[PDB]
């Protein structure tokens, strides 16, 4: 395909070229309709600066870079790739997963003094929410929350997920915002600022921690030392630091696609009206009429030591979708005599 | 294989070359899929600077170093090695061990005055936790704890391990952070700072101390004498002292692999529901359906003098895995008449 | 020709640190308005005790 990759050089030409190649590959995969979950495993094998790349067992086979330019101080890379969009996979027949973006906090407010970027966590969780909402393939964002999610309180995680109707809750801590000064006699000072982050995803059905990853990137701080920067403004997010943080958010989205996309989606029972039950997933999540679903009885217990545990009882109950709304759906129980055993909170999975 | 080893010279070219060779060998073994537990016994036989190395009874037979360069003040070593990844071994058929990283403390706060690196213990235990989580082969990290683990209180160790669900607890003391000054008339002063550490691993099932080792390394302190260094920042961990501490953490991980990896993993009984019991290990620990497990009745007593002791009663009970969750698993007792003798806290081992 | 560098007003090395915002209580978990991080003692003198 014909794609362009744009990335600014911070300290190494190799890193900027690799970032531009990643951007071009991401655009090519998005246009080709291929899954973006598989991209996050291709990057490690892209550390080398070889003109030709060979891969096996992937939707992309050979990568050939034809043009590399450093116009306006940032590397531009033009490549041609062959993408094979597979019609099958463990991610195409699943309903969309609702995700709640939790509180992202700055561990050390001391590091945010330069620029007074103290609301960077909130304005970055907003970016993560919008990235998951309008860029992901298998995720739906149900908003942000002001509460902090911890692994010590699975009950609170379950309650907050129930309140917001979220299958997973994602929250992080920003651990490094410090900067160093590089000085040259010919020119002015260069301030390279750090952005480290540790993201954690919790399963709202049982309170377990299902995802855990750490990110660290560096970018130039173009603003003055004594200048105050607003994190909601376009001045912050159009700068080199802002571009780096946007790339970090994209990597978060790609990692979530890589890890959670092929987990089987489990819509929950919202209400039971005799022989008809209601599902928390609807038309906007990919539900189509005539779908057959299998019911699981949910029983998740905190064990004797306070650690969350999971236990599902298999059921002989199968349901079919009768009416579909934008955000909910109605299902009819195919075994009327077993309809009395369905309670609120039981989960279902689509029969393939 | 084609590997590169990078290591900075501190006081001896031999030490830097050896560190670069260790780095290259570690990367080669990690890429080759060979076990990293065996690397820690190969280093002692690498003290000599011979161009050719001969070894017997190991996954690597001959080591030949072809390129040695001192570019940018740090030694780069390029070698070719032949690695034979064994499909067998006492470490491949075992479930992953959950490890809790305990409190690491600075024994003398006086030594941390230069740079005010007083939270070096906590920010280093974080590095050890991440190293065990995302670099080890046979370990899973269940987080960090703020409590101090001692050999005088096996009961506290058992309680904390139960609370965190950890099979082993690892904690240490930082015993040396002092520095010396090397002065030359031609150039500026060189401050070489010490980092000594004593790591101790306790078994959470009985409170015993199963591992004990001491580490000591030296690296240049590039910062000013009166400058304050933040131990969470990239300025600290990208410096020579930071690279040395990262190498120390890697050596800790390799020693844990060398010692604890071939211990038979013993998952614990979490809950008993009639004929079905729950296991604290799940899909993320390597549990697969159809596995056969043997039950052991656990009875560990503190003797008359207050010292921990172990005692397991063998059982005629065998269990098979029925359903697998990400963090737990369900087992069915193959002897229903003996199911009443299973209590919470009994351990199991996979039948090979 | 001066040999000295004048300080600048607003230096981050001397700027104040805005206190971290405390997390919300989420009273729905316990049914109570008590939160260990949010309670205010009626009789305390309110000495400085935290950043900011």
């Amino acid at each position: 395909y014909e794609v362009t990759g744009v990335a600014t050089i911070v300290s190494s030409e190799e890193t900027a070229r690799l970032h531009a190649l990643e951007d071009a590959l991401f655009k090519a995969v998005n246009f080709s309709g291929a899954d973006i979950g598989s991209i996050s495993n291709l990057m490690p094998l892209l550390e080398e600066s070889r003109n030709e790349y060979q891969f096996t067992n992937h939707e992309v086979r050979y990568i050939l870079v034809e043009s590399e330019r450093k116009r306006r101080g940032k590397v531009e890379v033009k490549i041609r790739v062959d993408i094979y969009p597979s019609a099958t996979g463990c991610h195409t027949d699943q309903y969309k997963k609702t995700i709640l973006v939790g509180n992202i906090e700055v561990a050390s407010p001391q590091q945010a003094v330069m620029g007074q970027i103290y609301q960077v966590g909130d304005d970055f969780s907003r970016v993560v929410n919008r990235q998951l909402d309008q860029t992901s393939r298998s995720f739906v964002s149900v908003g942000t929350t002001d509460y902090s999610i911890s692994s010590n309180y699975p009950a609170r995680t379950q309650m907050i997920a129930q309140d917001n109707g979220a299958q997973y809750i994602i929250g992080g801590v920003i651990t490094d915002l410090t900067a160093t000064v590089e000085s040259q006699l010919l020119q002015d000072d260069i301030i390279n600022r750090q952005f480290a982050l540790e993201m954690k995803v919790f399963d709202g059905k049982t309170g377990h921690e299902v995802f855990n990853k750490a990110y660290r990137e560096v970018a130039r701080w173009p603003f003055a030392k004594t200048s105050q920067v607003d994190t909601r403004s376009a001045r912050f997010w159009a700068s080199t630091y802002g571009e780096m943080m946007l790339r970090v958010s994209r990597n978060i989205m790609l990692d979530l696609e890589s890890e959670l996309s092929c987990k089987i989606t489990l819509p929950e029972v919202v209400a039971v009206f005799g022989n008809t039950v209601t599902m928390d997933l609807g038309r906007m999540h990919g539900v189509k009429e005539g779908d057959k679903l299998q019911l699981w009885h949910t029983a998740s217990f905190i064990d004797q030591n306070g650690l969350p545990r999971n236990k599902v009882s298999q059921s002989e109950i199968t349901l079919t979708v009768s009416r579909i709304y934008e955000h909910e759906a109605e299902l009819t129980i195919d075994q009327p005599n077993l309809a009395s055993s369905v309670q609120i909170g039981d989960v279902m999975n689509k029969i393939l | 294989y084609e590997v590169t080893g990078v290591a900075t010279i501190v006081s001896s070219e031999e030490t830097a070359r050896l560190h670069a060779l260790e780095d290259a060998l570690f990367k080669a073994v990690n890429f080759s899929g060979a076990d990293i537990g065996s690397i820690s016994n190969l280093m002692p036989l690498l003290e000599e600077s011979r161009n050719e190395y001969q070894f017997t009874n190991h996954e690597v037979r001959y080591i030949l170093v072809e390129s040695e360069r001192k570019r940018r003040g740090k030694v780069e070593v390029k070698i070719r090695v032949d690695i034979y990844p064994s499909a067998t071994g006492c470490h491949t058929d075992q479930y992953k061990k959950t490890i809790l990283v305990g409190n690491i403390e600075v024994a003398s706060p006086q030594q941390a005055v230069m740079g005010q690196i007083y939270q070096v213990g906590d920010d280093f235990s974080r590095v050890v936790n991440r190293q065990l989580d995302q670099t080890s082969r046979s370990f899973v990290s269940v987080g960090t704890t703020d409590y101090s683990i001692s050999s005088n209180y096996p009961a506290r160790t058992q309680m904390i391990a139960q609370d965190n669900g950890a099979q082993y607890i690892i904690g240490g003391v930082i015993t040396d952070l002092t520095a010396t000054v090397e002065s030359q008339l031609l150039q500026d002063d060189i401050i070489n700072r010490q980092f000594a550490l004593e790591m101790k691993v306790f078994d959470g099932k009985t409170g015993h101390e199963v591992f004990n080792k001491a580490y000591r390394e030296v690296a240049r302190w590039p910062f000013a004498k009166t400058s304050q260094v933040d131990t969470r920042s990239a300025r600290f961990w990208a410096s020579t002292y930071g690279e040395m501490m990262l190498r120390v953490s890697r050596n800790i991980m390799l020693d844990l692999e060398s010692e604890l990896s071939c211990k038979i993993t013993l998952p614990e009984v979490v809950a008993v529901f009639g004929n079905t019991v729950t296991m604290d290990l799940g899909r993320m620990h390597g549990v697969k359906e159809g596995d056969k497990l043997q039950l052991w009745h656990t009875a560990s007593f503190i003797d008359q003098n207050g010292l921990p002791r172990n005692k397991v009663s063998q059982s005629e009970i065998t269990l098979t895995v029925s359903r697998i969750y990400e963090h737990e698993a369900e087992l069915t007792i193959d002897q229903p008449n003996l199911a009443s003798s299973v209590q919470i806290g009994d351990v199991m081992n996979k039948i090979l | 020709l001066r040999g000295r560098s004048d300080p600048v007003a607003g230096d981050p090395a001397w700027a104040p640190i805005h206190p971290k915002k405390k997390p919300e209580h989420y009273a729905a978990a316990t049914g109570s308005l008590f939160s260990a991080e949010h309670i205010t003692d009626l009789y305390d003198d309110s000495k400085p005790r935290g950043i900011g």
Binding site: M114, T178, V181, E182, I191, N192 | T226, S227, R235 | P12
Partner: peptide, 14 residues
Amino acid sequence: TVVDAVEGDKSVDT
């Protein structure tokens, strides 16, 4: 680099 931006470089006697 080894110089912090916030604090700065802290680094005829004969």
